[PDB]
Design an enzyme around this catalytic site. Structure first.
Site, PDB file in Angstrom:
ATOM      1  N   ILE A 101      25.144   2.185   2.136  1.00  0.00           N
ATOM      2  CA  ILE A 101      25.300   0.703   2.434  1.00  0.00           C
ATOM      3  C   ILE A 101      24.806   0.041   1.075  1.00  0.00           C
ATOM      4  O   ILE A 101      23.725   0.188   0.426  1.00  0.00           O
ATOM      5  CB  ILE A 101      24.362   0.283   3.349  1.00  0.00           C
ATOM      6  CG1 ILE A 101      24.971   0.801   4.816  1.00  0.00           C
ATOM      7  CG2 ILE A 101      24.387  -1.100   3.423  1.00  0.00           C
ATOM      8  CD1 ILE A 101      23.959   0.440   5.885  1.00  0.00           C
ATOM      9  N   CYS A 102      25.932  -0.931   0.704  1.00  0.00           N
ATOM     10  CA  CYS A 102      25.524  -1.878  -0.140  1.00  0.00           C
ATOM     11  C   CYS A 102      25.165  -3.112   0.466  1.00  0.00           C
ATOM     12  O   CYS A 102      25.962  -4.061   0.849  1.00  0.00           O
ATOM     13  CB  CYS A 102      26.657  -2.148  -1.235  1.00  0.00           C
ATOM     14  SG  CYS A 102      26.447  -3.031  -2.731  1.00  0.00           S
ATOM     15  N   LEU A 103      23.849  -3.313   0.185  1.00  0.00           N
ATOM     16  CA  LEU A 103      22.995  -4.523   0.565  1.00  0.00           C
ATOM     17  C   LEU A 103      22.060  -4.961  -0.407  1.00  0.00           C
ATOM     18  O   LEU A 103      21.248  -4.551  -0.922  1.00  0.00           O
ATOM     19  CB  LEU A 103      22.044  -4.292   1.797  1.00  0.00           C
ATOM     20  CG  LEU A 103      21.547  -5.249   2.845  1.00  0.00           C
ATOM     21  CD1 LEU A 103      22.921  -5.967   3.570  1.00  0.00           C
ATOM     22  CD2 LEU A 103      20.979  -4.692   3.938  1.00  0.00           C
TER      23      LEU A 103
END
Lengths: 166, 124
Positions: A101-103
């Site tokens: 995930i790119c958070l």
């Protein structure tokens, strides 16, 4: 440290238990956002699992999602590592094959130790209703959005999720 | 007996084919509709044949070709059946309808003008 880490997670675990056990939306703002958040193995407090429901008016509607949380021993100085199951979701900012995930909030630049696991899983949920496609992990889904092809966007996602169950 | 996964692009001519769609709704096919190159909605019968078995998610409508080719990529189906004669202003075939890119994500590409071949492929 792991002594200051452990007493945090124990504090969080209490707060998680209390908030999620309520069915009243003043005490539980995550009603229909976070179905469960527990540690995978009661004895190992470093790995955790959450189930979220997809946001309304998105292609993720009406499908649950299992999330893996890895808490580092240097938590909360560093962020936890959060990711989906493999081949579980299509999204601009999720690399489907790994679960990654790119958070933004989990990036070293912008991590504030004020945030806890619930704000984190919520931030993941928030992301499904609103993706940033300028910097995507799934270039193909990204280019779909970046062309305003909403017919394709909702079609492929609803397709993926439907075949996931079969 | 055992068929390959297909990705069918549903322009005017392919919708017009006399295929018994209920026979194929159950398999691993995906129908991408280019609404940009077909004015109305997709033929009501084709939709009904898929809904009837709860396979309505196998139909993807597409606002833009760039949107359609992105799907092809991400789905990564074995076959990709189309008819390039529908997307050209000059009525003939032009291999420039399919991005040079596609050979990476898909095994077999059938681009046919002839009815038999199209029916032969989709029906194995």
């Amino acid at each position: 440290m792991a002594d200051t880490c452990m007493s945090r997670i124990v504090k969080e675990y209490k707060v998680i238990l209390k908030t999620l056990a309520s069915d009243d939306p003043i005490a539980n703002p995550y009603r229909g956002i976070i179905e469960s958040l527990n540690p995978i193995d009661e004895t190992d407090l470093s790995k955790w699992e959450a189930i979220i429901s997809g946001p309304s008016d998105t292609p993720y509607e009406n499908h649950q999602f299992r999330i893996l949380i890895e808490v580092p021993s240097s938590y909360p100085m560093n962020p936890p590592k959060i990711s989906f199951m493999q081949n579980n979701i299509l999204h601009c900012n999720v690399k489907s094959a790994t679960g990654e995930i790119c958070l933004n909030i989990l990036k070293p630049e912008e991590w504030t130790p004020v945030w806890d696991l619930l704000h984190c899983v919520h931030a993941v949920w928030r992301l499904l209703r609103e993706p940033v496609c300028d910097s995507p992990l799934d270039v193909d889904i990204g280019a779909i959005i970046r062309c305003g092809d909403m017919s394709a966007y909702q079609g492929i996602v609803k397709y993926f999720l439907a075949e996931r169950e079969r | 007996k055992a068929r390959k996964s297909k990705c069918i692009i549903m322009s005017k001519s392919i919708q017009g084919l006399p295929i018994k769609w209920e026979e194929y709704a159950a398999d691993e096919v995906v129908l991408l509709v280019p609404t940009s190159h077909t004015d109305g909605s997709m033929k009501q019968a084709i939709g009904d044949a898929f809904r009837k078995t709860k396979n309505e998610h196998k139909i993807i409508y597409c606002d833009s070709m760039d949107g359609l080719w992105s799907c092809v990529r991400r789905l990564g189906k074995f076959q990709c059946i189309l008819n390039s004669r529908d997307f050209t202003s000059s009525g003939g075939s032009d291999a420039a309808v399919v991005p040079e890119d596609i050979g990476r994500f898909v095994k077999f590409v059938v681009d046919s003008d002839v009815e038999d071949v199209l029916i032969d492929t989709l029906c194995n």
